[PDB]
Enzyme design. Sequence first.
Site, PDB file in Angstrom:
ATOM      1  N   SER A 130      64.968 -24.379 -50.578  1.00 34.51           N
ATOM      2  CA  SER A 130      65.775 -25.295 -49.771  1.00 34.51           C
ATOM      3  C   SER A 130      66.723 -26.059 -50.705  1.00 34.51           C
ATOM      4  CB  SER A 130      64.842 -26.161 -48.913  1.00 34.51           C
ATOM      5  OG  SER A 130      65.544 -26.735 -47.815  1.00 34.51           O
ATOM      6  N   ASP A 176      66.387 -18.835 -40.083  1.00 32.87           N
ATOM      7  CA  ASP A 176      66.385 -20.178 -40.642  1.00 32.87           C
ATOM      8  C   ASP A 176      67.439 -21.030 -39.937  1.00 32.87           C
ATOM      9  OD1 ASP A 176      66.642 -22.421 -42.350  1.00 32.87           O
ATOM     10  OD2 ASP A 176      66.323 -21.230 -44.153  1.00 32.87           O
ATOM     11  N   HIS A 208      62.812 -21.277 -41.871  1.00 30.71           N
ATOM     12  CA  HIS A 208      63.040 -21.950 -43.147  1.00 30.71           C
ATOM     13  C   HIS A 208      61.769 -22.100 -43.971  1.00 30.71           C
ATOM     14  CE1 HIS A 208      65.361 -24.399 -45.847  1.00 30.71           C
ATOM     15  NE2 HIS A 208      64.529 -25.419 -45.756  1.00 30.71           N
TER      16      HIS A 208
END
Length: 260
Positions: A130, A176, A208
């Site tokens: 991320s 995601d 995600h």
Amino acid sequence: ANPYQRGPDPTESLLRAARGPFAVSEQSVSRLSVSGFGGGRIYYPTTTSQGTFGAIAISPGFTASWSSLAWLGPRLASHGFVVIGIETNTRLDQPDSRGRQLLAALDYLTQRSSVRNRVDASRLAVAGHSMGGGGTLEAAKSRTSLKAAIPIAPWNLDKTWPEVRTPTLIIGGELDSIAPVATHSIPFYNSLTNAREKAYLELNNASHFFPQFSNDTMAKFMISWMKRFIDDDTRYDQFLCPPPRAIGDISDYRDTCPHT
């Protein structure tokens, strides 16, 4: 013949098992003991008889602690790598800051840590989830000597990465919604015009949060990329080139085969 080659001739089963062939030791790094990152945990092969190992620093994402990725520590280290998983200075640090912290962790590992003698300081890498994946790109932009970079569901408002020379594998989640691949992963990938080699692995129907849980296909490709580029271990090209078919748990794969 390759002085950096470690471990047995590889197979699909070896890569998909919960651990690779090395027993793993661990060392905590207290936040009280380091500057430039928030401490973390080091994972390393216990044995020294097969030589030194390359190393990778790994960052969690926004709001997250190292525990969100901790399964990677023993799993990657057990294939013959020293892993430093970091806590960040605060949970809300941005991608560029995470990049600086990944580099500070590698510097600590090689210059000061009590496992520095086990690490080949010339063979280093970065990865992260991320915003930590955004920071992986930042670190590679700043340190072109890094041998591998693995942004995982990366998030970054900086979309282009022409300075990166390091072999880079981006692992995205098809579905995601936090760092959508159409606006983060794929633009990053297309912008890596000077990366010596690159690949994009898209995990079918994945959100995600796919890295917060042991994922054998993710680990297979991360380990293969690390072996191929940190260790120059051409035995692991068999898993990368030709590229895998986009079927089953792979919704897309993009490559730069051959890996000269």
